[PDB]
Amino acid sequence: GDLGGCPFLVAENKTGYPTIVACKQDCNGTTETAPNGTRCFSIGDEGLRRMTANLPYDCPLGQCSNGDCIPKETYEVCYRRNWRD
């Protein structure tokens, strides 16, 4: 063991409910894949990082299938919430 461990970056709704922004990631060469059917936003780690903190964005909803966030063509307001910045 020693493989993986990296947690998934999350967007949140106004009150703090988290949703992942990617359905897979690479952790030091180990791929980690979210369970099929998991709710996600199809914006990616990059997308979350580009969001201005504490501002509302219309985030595209999806559902994980084999490591990919498959968009539902629906949207929900989501936020990037830093500890500090």
Residue numbers in the entry: 7 to 91
Original paper wording:
Anti-chemokine activity has been described in the extracts of tick salivary glands, and we have recently described the cloning and characterization of such chemokine binding proteins from a tick salivary gland cDNA library, which we have named Evasins. Evasin-1 is a small 94-amino acid protein which binds CCL3/MIP-1α and CCL4/MIP-1β with very high affinity (0.16 and 0.81 nM, respectively), and also displays lower affinity binding (3.2 nM) to a closely related member of the CC chemokine family, CCL18/ PARC. This chemokine-binding protein does not share any relevant sequence or structural homology to any other known proteins, notably the viral chemokine-binding proteins, and moreover, is considerably smaller, being only 10 kDa compared to the viral proteins which range in size between 30–40 kDa. The Evasin-1 secondary structure is composed of seven beta strands forming three anti-parallel beta sheets, one short alpha helix, and contains four disulfide bridges.
We have determined the crystal structure of both non-glycosylated (accession code: 3 fpr) and glycosylated Evasin-1 (accession code: 3 fpt), to 1.7 Å and 2.70 Å respectively. The crystal structure of the non-glycosylated Evasin-1 contains two molecules per asymmetric unit, monomer A (Asp5-Asp91) and monomer B (Gly10-Trp89). The overall structure of the Evasin-1 molecule is boat shaped, with approximate dimensions of 35 Å × 20 Å × 13 Å. The four disulfide bridges consist of: Cys12-Cys33 connecting the N-terminal region of strand β1with β3; Cys29-Cys70 connecting the beginning of β3 with β6; Cys46-Cys75 connecting the strands β5 with β7 in the beta sheet β5-β6-β7 and finally Cys65-Cys84 connecting the other two strands β6 with β7 in the same beta sheet. The disulfide bridges are positioned along the interior of the protein, forming a central core, and undoubtedly conferring structural rigidity by stabilization of the protein core. The C-terminal loop points to the solvent, presenting the aromatic residue Trp89 totally exposed and located in a flexible region with a Cα B-factor = 50.0 Å2, much higher than the average B-factor  = 34.8 Å2 for the whole protein chain of monomer A (B-factor for the Cα of monomer A  = 32.8 Å2, calculated with BAVERAGE from CCP4, 1994).
